[PDB]
RNA sequence: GAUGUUAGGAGGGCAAAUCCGCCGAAUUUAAGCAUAUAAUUAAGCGGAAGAAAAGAAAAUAACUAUGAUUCCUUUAGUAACG
RNA sequence: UGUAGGAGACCGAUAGCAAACAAGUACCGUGAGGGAAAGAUGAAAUAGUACUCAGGAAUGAGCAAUUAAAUAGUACCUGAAA
RNA sequence: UCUUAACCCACUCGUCUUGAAACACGGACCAAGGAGUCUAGCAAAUGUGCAAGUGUAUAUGAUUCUUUAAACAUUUUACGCA
RNA sequence: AUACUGACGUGCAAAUCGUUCAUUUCAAUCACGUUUAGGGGCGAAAGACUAAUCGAAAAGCCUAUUAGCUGGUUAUUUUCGA
RNA sequence: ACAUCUCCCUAGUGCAGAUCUUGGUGGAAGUAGCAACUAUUCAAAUGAGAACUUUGAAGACUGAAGUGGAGAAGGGUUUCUUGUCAACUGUGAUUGAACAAGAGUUAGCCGCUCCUAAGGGAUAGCUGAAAAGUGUUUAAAGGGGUCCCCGUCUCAAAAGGGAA
RNA sequence: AGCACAGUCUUAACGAUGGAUGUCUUGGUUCCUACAGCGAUGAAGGCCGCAGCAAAAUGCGAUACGCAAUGAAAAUUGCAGUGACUGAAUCAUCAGAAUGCUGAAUGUAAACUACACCAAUUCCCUGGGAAUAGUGGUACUCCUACAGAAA
């Protein structure tokens, strides 16, 4: 180190040269993903392949205002709907078994 | 040496057969050779 | 010279007699070639191919007869059985893979997935 | 001593203690200890060390014309049933 | 152009040009047909055969008509009766002509040729 | 538990780029060197596959909570360790 | 890695894979191993040096001779410097 | 222009070293090849676009499909940094 | 293999050759086969020997190890210049 | 097959030198040198051509611890006949252990092959992650017998043993 | 038909020498896309063969630079030789047939073409006749079944 230069924070002391990867497949990978889902939807008669999530709260002090897609409706919400677990699997709604359905408002 | 082994004798006879020069007709449609004194079979 | 279908016409005694005849002729050509004579040398290739045709036809007929002999009854001899990859041979059957417990059978039959629309 | 360390030593050289090796074909069978240096012949294991790339590559599948594997190629692509043929005229 | 199945490289096309199977050799031994014949057969160009009658349109030998002697598939050269040349020792052989340089007058008819003409028309 | 050229079957070995296990260093860095560093890297011995392993809560949170696995963007060169 | 495609603001025969090639070869090492040098006549040789003379022969020369071209003749493109 | 002449002047180049014409070191000769680069992160500089915002991340989308491996788009409290 | 510190010393030879000299019935010499392997062996001890290799063999790799030290470090003009 | 100075991007981008790398080449130089091992001569033949090929005559030498016979290792068609001379045969060369075309090694009895040894590799076990380290040592195991009595195996000598 | 000085150095011209330069390029190079295991039913590796004239990498395996079959399909050719006017000559495809000795390599062996043991074996013909010393099987571990022994 010399002059006004800040202390470095690089970790290239270990043999990184065989532990490094450069992405040149990105846009074609994106095309392949698009092609795969498009092919799948079309094969299913063009019927939706999309999954309908519950709305759930984002956690702690920072994100408590915000709400996002959750894992699955679970029994109390399904019972309130009048829908079976078997029906929930049969249809596009998202499925779970251990997400508690919490407060009344949610 | 003077007495011999059937496998060795056969391979040596092969090497001798391979050694002999190319057909001249082939050039009308020779990269490798051995000489016994200066090149041994290395066996 | 000789052509496969003509050989396939022949009975096994007749085909073998032709095979033996060709060997004797082939030997005569070979002896002639070994001698200082150059009269018939090129014909030896043709005869060797003719012998090859005889043997292929006889062997195909014999193989078919063996297959006819071991028609069904579950087991052909080892190397008359299916030669396929060792892995493919080892592999679990799709039929067995498909099969499932009674509770699984109930689950499948009762609850398959269905296709849908919206307004 | 006329067998001295240097030229004199080489005159007493006779009696090769390495031979060809049937499972090798590259001269490497130590006769005295009955062992191939290159391919490990008395052992079932083939002695295929990974510390030399040159040694690793200079014997490999596709050296020896591949008498069944070469034949196997294309069959995978084709996917005919075994025992099947083209149809007659 | 549009297909991405086949290379647009110089390199692959050349290798294919040199390593040709026989049907490919036959394709690149085709010659253009005579004008009324093109109308007759509905066909621009035809693979050369033994007893064909060609006219030369290029080289020092241009404007000569004649029957095809022998076809050399390997050097891609046809030989025609009146394009003789004497060699260094005065032996007479026929000049080999690449099939690009000849236009076909009377094609030889045969069963295989009939099938080709039936396929084309 | 033995014994069987009894009848039917299976394993062995090879190939290895990626994968999974074990077993497992040092040159090197600190301008010396011992802890630390190279690095749970290389070599060694094993096992697999067209991907493998992982995976359906003895989990994270302290919210208005989330809710199998994998991957990316990130947190983050940060809490922390020295 | 094996096989198959498609590529290039890549190299252009001392470069690029060790290998544009009969090279993982020759060759060297007791062996483990180590490991090369090595492409191009012309449009066409189904144009590859006919013929004559002098030569023991090699060769040489030619009034002779292919080619558009032979100080283009297969150790054949161009043919720098020393 | 080349060429010698002649008058006057004219010590082996590179090199490390305060100091080489040196009894300091390297250089028989000629040809080709032959040595401050690339990545990461940071800084100042200067350009450029925007400004209390900025970048559009992973990714989605399209009447985008030789060149397209880019280009184009993103149905109001994501994240980095400020 | 003692001496001639002989010849030889770009050899006949990376230890030869000549003459001299020691040994010659035993702790003898020779062959072949065999054993003991690398911080290991083996040593009538000289750190001797272990394939023209030894106060730690050969092969390959970590490795392009590291080097405050040696050497080299490539067209032109102009400006400021230790 | 070649340019762009019109503009601008990009780079394995500029050599005299590194005891540079690689390749070629000089002066040194027709020089150093071709000195172990007592010696050749004459005539003839062959051939283009003969000091050193062949034949003969002489002269000589090796001097049974032989430049003589045989065999082992090791080499491997080098052998032999028939050709032969681009390069090689450190001189010459018609010669040749070089090159070209062929030919040729014959076993009941000679060897190997067989037997065991010094040795080596395993089974049985047992350890060790395995790799390996060991080897009758906590075994239900090859032979002889009218169901009985015996028993670790295996390779290892081209000079030991070993029919002819 | 004469006349030159020599040697050394320099210059120009013209050649030898040498293989640079330039031009190529059925090769390399990196990336992206795509599929992706072989083996006791004997792989990979290694030998030994096999071409009319044939040494070699290539190719093939005792039917051996291909056999059969399919789709193309008239030539082949250094010489000899082999066909056509479409199962022939040529290719490509390649599913059928064939695939020496080995090699995990597995009857005991191994610087060996050495050596055991049990089955003698094959073909042809329509329930029989001929050939041939030839061909297989017999490793180690595991498993299921059976057996006769041992609680």
XYZ file of C-alpha atoms in Angstrom, chain C:
119
model
C -21.363 -64.825 -59.591
C -23.922 -66.761 -57.438
C -26.698 -64.559 -55.949
C -28.226 -64.866 -52.441
C -31.880 -65.659 -53.354
C -30.755 -68.648 -55.457
C -28.908 -69.965 -52.396
C -31.942 -69.254 -50.162
C -33.954 -71.471 -52.529
C -31.653 -74.458 -51.784
C -32.107 -77.169 -49.120
C -29.387 -77.575 -46.446
C -27.786 -80.612 -48.076
C -27.751 -78.833 -51.460
C -26.331 -75.594 -50.023
C -23.531 -77.450 -48.192
C -22.671 -79.394 -51.384
C -22.255 -76.014 -53.143
C -20.149 -74.799 -50.174
C -17.841 -77.834 -50.423
C -17.557 -77.448 -54.222
C -16.500 -73.809 -53.813
C -13.837 -74.753 -51.199
C -12.338 -77.357 -53.549
C -12.365 -74.860 -56.480
C -10.931 -72.111 -54.207
C -8.144 -74.504 -53.192
C -7.422 -75.230 -56.889
C -7.115 -71.499 -57.557
C -4.927 -71.102 -54.447
C -2.620 -73.956 -55.610
C -2.530 -72.325 -59.079
C -1.646 -68.957 -57.475
C 1.063 -70.690 -55.393
C 2.470 -72.157 -58.642
C 4.247 -69.782 -61.093
C 1.039 -69.489 -63.151
C -0.874 -66.161 -63.377
C -3.797 -67.595 -65.344
C -6.741 -67.387 -62.918
C -5.471 -65.292 -59.965
C -8.129 -62.510 -60.074
C -10.976 -65.046 -59.910
C -10.018 -66.036 -56.332
C -11.627 -62.861 -54.874
C -14.914 -63.719 -56.603
C -14.834 -67.278 -55.292
C -14.011 -66.070 -51.764
C -17.029 -63.732 -51.957
C -19.178 -66.605 -53.368
C -18.111 -68.784 -50.379
C -19.000 -65.880 -48.102
C -22.485 -65.621 -49.645
C -23.079 -69.387 -49.180
C -22.041 -69.231 -45.530
C -24.110 -66.115 -44.757
C -27.225 -67.663 -46.338
C -26.694 -71.017 -44.581
C -26.074 -69.285 -41.238
C -29.158 -67.036 -41.632
C -31.275 -70.128 -42.378
C -29.762 -72.016 -39.418
C -30.347 -68.981 -37.125
C -33.985 -68.830 -38.304
C -34.339 -72.582 -37.633
C -32.922 -72.059 -34.126
C -35.402 -69.209 -33.597
C -38.178 -71.497 -34.943
C -37.032 -74.283 -32.567
C -37.033 -71.887 -29.578
C -40.346 -70.234 -30.523
C -41.803 -69.061 -27.193
C -41.402 -71.100 -23.960
C -40.030 -67.984 -22.197
C -36.299 -68.713 -22.479
C -34.107 -68.788 -25.545
C -30.404 -69.681 -24.845
C -28.464 -66.693 -23.292
C -26.907 -65.123 -26.396
C -29.944 -65.936 -28.543
C -31.825 -63.750 -26.007
C -32.109 -59.937 -26.311
C -28.698 -58.225 -26.490
C -29.369 -54.667 -25.414
C -27.517 -52.367 -22.978
C -26.599 -53.952 -19.623
C -28.341 -50.993 -17.973
C -31.502 -51.383 -20.080
C -31.543 -55.095 -19.252
C -31.070 -54.290 -15.538
C -33.747 -51.501 -15.535
C -37.091 -51.822 -13.666
C -40.148 -52.434 -15.925
C -42.443 -49.446 -16.754
C -45.342 -51.800 -15.859
C -43.847 -52.347 -12.402
C -42.910 -48.621 -12.139
C -46.537 -47.706 -12.958
C -48.024 -50.072 -10.316
C -48.920 -48.579 -6.921
C -50.483 -49.203 -3.455
C -54.260 -49.393 -2.947
C -54.347 -45.981 -1.206
C -52.313 -44.565 -4.132
C -54.732 -46.257 -6.594
C -57.671 -44.601 -4.805
C -55.885 -41.222 -4.868
C -55.202 -41.424 -8.634
C -58.677 -42.633 -9.650
C -60.645 -40.266 -7.437
C -58.516 -37.134 -7.860
C -56.970 -36.642 -11.397
C -56.296 -33.077 -12.584
C -58.644 -31.343 -15.064
C -58.438 -28.460 -17.566
C -60.237 -25.163 -17.254
C -61.289 -21.685 -18.437
C -62.363 -18.316 -16.900
C -64.756 -15.407 -17.733
